[PDB]
Design a protein around this nucleic acid. Sequence first.
RNA 1: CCGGGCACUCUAACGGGACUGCCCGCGAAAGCGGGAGGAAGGAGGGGACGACGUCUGGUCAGCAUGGCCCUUACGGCCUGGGCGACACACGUGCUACAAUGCCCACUACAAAGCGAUGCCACCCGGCAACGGGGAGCUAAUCGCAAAAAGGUGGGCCCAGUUCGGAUUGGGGUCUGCAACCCGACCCCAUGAAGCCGGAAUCGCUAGUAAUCGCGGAUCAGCCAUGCCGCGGUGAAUACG
RNA 2: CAAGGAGGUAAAAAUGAA
Lengths: 128, 118, 82, 155, 206, 60, 25, 99, 92
Amino acid sequence: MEQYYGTGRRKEAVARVFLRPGNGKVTVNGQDFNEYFQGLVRAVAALEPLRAVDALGHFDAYITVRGGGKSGQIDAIKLGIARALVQYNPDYRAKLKPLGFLTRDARVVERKKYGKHKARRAPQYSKR
Amino acid sequence: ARIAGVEIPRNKRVDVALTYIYGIGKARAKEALEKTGINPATRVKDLTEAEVVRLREYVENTWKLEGELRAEVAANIKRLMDIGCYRGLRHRRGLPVRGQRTRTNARTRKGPRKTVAG
Amino acid sequence: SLKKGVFVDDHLLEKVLELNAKGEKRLIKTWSRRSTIVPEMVGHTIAVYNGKQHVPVYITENMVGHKLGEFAPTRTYRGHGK
Amino acid sequence: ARRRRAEVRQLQPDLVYGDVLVTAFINKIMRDGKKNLAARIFYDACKIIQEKTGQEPLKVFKQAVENVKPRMEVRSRRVGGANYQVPMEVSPRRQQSLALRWLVQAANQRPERRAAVRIAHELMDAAEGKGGAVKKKEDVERMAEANRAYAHYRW
Amino acid sequence: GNKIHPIGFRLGITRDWESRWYAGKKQYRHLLLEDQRIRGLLEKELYSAGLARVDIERAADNVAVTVHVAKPGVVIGRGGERIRVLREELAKLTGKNVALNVQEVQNPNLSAPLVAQRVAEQIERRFAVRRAIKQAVQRVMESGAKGAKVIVSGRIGGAEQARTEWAAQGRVPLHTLRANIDYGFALARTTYGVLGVKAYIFLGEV
Amino acid sequence: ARKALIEKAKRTPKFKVRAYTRCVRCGRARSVYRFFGLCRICLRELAHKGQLPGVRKASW
Amino acid sequence: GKGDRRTRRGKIWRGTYGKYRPRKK
Amino acid sequence: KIRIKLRGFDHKTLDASAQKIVEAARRSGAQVSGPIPLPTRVRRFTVIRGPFKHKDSREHFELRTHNRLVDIINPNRKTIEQLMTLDLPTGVEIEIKTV
Amino acid sequence: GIKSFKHKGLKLLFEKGVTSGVPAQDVDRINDRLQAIDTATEIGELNRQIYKLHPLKGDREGYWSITVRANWRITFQFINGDAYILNYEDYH
RNA sequence: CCGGGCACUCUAACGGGACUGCCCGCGAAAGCGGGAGGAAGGAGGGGACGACGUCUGGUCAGCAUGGCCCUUACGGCCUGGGCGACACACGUGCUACAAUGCCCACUACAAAGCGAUGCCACCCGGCAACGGGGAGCUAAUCGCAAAAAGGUGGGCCCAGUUCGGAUUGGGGUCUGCAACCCGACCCCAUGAAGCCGGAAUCGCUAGUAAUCGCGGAUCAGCCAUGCCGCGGUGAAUACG
RNA sequence: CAAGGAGGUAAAAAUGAA
Ligand SMILES: [Mg+2]
Ligand SMILES: [Mg+2]
Ligand SMILES: [Mg+2]
Ligand SMILES: [Mg+2]
Ligand SMILES: [Mg+2]
Ligand SMILES: [Mg+2]
Ligand SMILES: [Mg+2]
Ligand SMILES: [Mg+2]
Ligand SMILES: [Mg+2]
Ligand SMILES: [Mg+2]
Ligand SMILES: [Zn+2]
């Protein structure tokens, strides 16, 4: 029906966020924003930028997600939701900065380095 | 109920209670009660005496178990008595049968450490 | 553990079968456990190599899947100080 | 040699509550990095608080932490091959950390069967001033009490 | 010590390859062995030329081979031999397009392989090594170089005691990537053993 | 046993399982990559030489 | 029971499949 | 209809030689789908840095094999004429098939 | 009497006469030493000037060391008329 | 999945992007602290890069090479044995002692790589390993793979116990000329020690430790619980 | 504000290689 940007990424996760101006606070992809994310406590934190603004269900969510696991996807959705409402509302910048909902968060899994057992964990020794 | 040579397991699921017999384990367990046609999740507490009879009659027959098959197993090792093979000597010396590492480990057949020192 | 093969040495069997018609002498060697116990010629002795010498092993039924060299230990051990 | 004073790590606020404290507690619950199971247990126990008492877990948990706060603790210091134990004050950061740590530990010390009921009960006991963690807190303050002699070494 | 090969350290940016062909599996192994046997066969009966490089290129039975030499004196005009069957003897285990070219390395005093090889000859001539090192460096530095460094290690002047003679003028930054640093090496065979000569030649970049 | 041993490695008859890899540049029997037909030692040498087409240092 | 050959978990760890871990569907 | 593939170890030679064929096909009467960047097949291997026996601290190498695709529409012998045997690679392997 | 070896080359030279485990020019040298350590009824007999005998210190305590040639030493434990753990080691 | 379109995602090639440049303060300067500035900052987070030299360090068994030695042999071929021996001692590890746990069923969410002298979809037999077929794939096309921890449901109820899997009997399968010494799996039955570790001792400061599975090299097969990589969920604390 | 001269000083921790 409609379109509003959408590019949220966090630790190898890609989420395209749209939102369509309608009172139906809806979902996307598999099932519900619930259902697909049930049993997961921190899953509902992706909708916090909407709480930061005046959106108590004014948009119809549409986020296709891929890559990583749920938590990264959820994190990426947060970046995409914010990337939408900051796009078609350029004055909604003065809340995405103090609250910091706009950052790709470069925190990604560090490489296995040789010698070490895994990333940084040293292989443990005895002199004797 | 004195099923085979044992009777012990009371209030604890017949599919589990069965396990408490040398010869039953876990696979023969549910296999025996599906072939006898009895609910696995039952109390074991002396339920329907008929189910118990059928169970006993099937289980105790069919395949060898308890003290009888312990005797057969011990006799299969006694096979390599006579002038037996290499595998027999491993049962003789008390060392691991399957040719594994004995430089360390192998404590489950050797037993606890003895320590020589020198 | 073979099933459709279940093999014995051809050369062990050649020597074993052509010396099986109406009787023989127990003088028969080999160099391979590789084979199998072989029914017939049960009342026989097969000098199996253990890496050092030829040990006369004797067949008296009882044995089958155990080829030969299981009846020919290669090590000695014997004791560890005690 | 700590050239940097190591800035205080800040957390994410939880769901439904907004705590700047509860998440720190959920983290201590967390083992092997499973925040799902960790958070669930706490919120589970929060539901358990509602049953045995008609109190909102946001205060029951809050007061429990406040009751398991070490005013002063014992610190081993200088001269004599580190022979002394100066009783020192406890920083608000450290009272914070000890409270939550002792809570979870004492909680798993309990003979109960489910992790949630251990958390819930240990919190209710601690809110009253009865918990095994409160024992630990009061114990650490005994040690700090008995060392007032060379407390003047201070620092 | 322990330092990485200044050639391999570049390879990508600065200093390109020496055998430039593409293949997938089932072919790479065979074509690399042939390629190396070309380098092996050439080095033998072409040392008197003193070859700085042996570039090789391929394109399905095309095998181009470029031999860089200070003085291509051993080529001698078309049918004057020293090329005919010589570039044709390659295809006795190849049979492919043995396209053998010859390059003229202008200044041998700026070619690291040639420098080290001249030094390694002098070791076998029983020359005074320390003086030989000094001269070769200045000789390289005399021909416009931005920096040079020669290294002979082990068994210097015979005598039971492995040594390491060291000399270097100007600038030689090995750590920098935009370096254009030529590296050469040579085995000096002596009646008392074997010693290795390293030669570093540096020019600007950016 | 080294010269007559790099003979067998190319000879390869008599049972298919008796055949084995072997570095060509050297005579190494261990750590022999099927891709190059070289041992890990030789492979490193030539990779620094530049005589290995496409082969380049790995940094990431 | 990562080392028990009679679990979907031990069969994972071992890699192989079987009766206690079928090759899907 | 004509599909051409260009594999290569050097990306700079590929990104240039497979761009020549975009110019030599466009200026001969055809529509050309530009340099399609197929993903790379990186072939790494890790070797112990020393000839001795120093297991910790080694050094690894990689052999990146690049793939690039280009499609031209009508197989007219006007565009065919140029891309027939006017090949300028350095060993770059080229595949030409129509389906 | 020599009763146990730690060095295989040493072991082979004294037992089978296999000389391929030691230096070729030290064959006669090592031999006369081993026979001396074999005939020795006490450590006092292994005291000829050309052996430079001495017991080792530290973790090698209980061991002895006669000199073959240069930086090379034959080390062993002498006890009750017998030497044990005959090794062929380095001065550094 | 088609028509069509390629703006999103992605793919891979060149670029832009902070240089504490800008504000307040400190200072002689360098610089330090603080603040809007943006994805990012006062070397952004990781790699590759290891000075003169030290250890008579390491490697003549990768290779090269001075010297010493062996040559009907210290060389060459073969079958077999051995490197896998076991009263013991030490290193690095794997799997655990359980209920923030175990079993069964259902149901999701990855990345990095490997394959047509192979990966092998889908059917058929089989409790299963696997065998019979047999389509596609010179591979962002087909296949290896369903990621697992997670979620939902249900069952055990704290007990050497549905924890734990060692050891042992039996029955099978696959590679291989052949698996007794000495192969990996599958299935039935056994189910040991261990209820959390003495003196001591190790690792890690942010996607980090922990925990979870996934690929590759070698490789007929495999003794890999190893090594080199990949991503999933994701702490604690630093006064000094 | 810028210090001269004044005085209480570590612990329990020994050895050395060929
Ligand atoms: Mg990880
Ligand atoms: Mg290691
Ligand atoms: Mg640098
Ligand atoms: Mg030395
Ligand atoms: Mg040699
Ligand atoms: Mg070994
Ligand atoms: Mg016990
Ligand atoms: Mg218990
Ligand atoms: Mg650090
Ligand atoms: Mg003394
Ligand atoms: Zn080699």
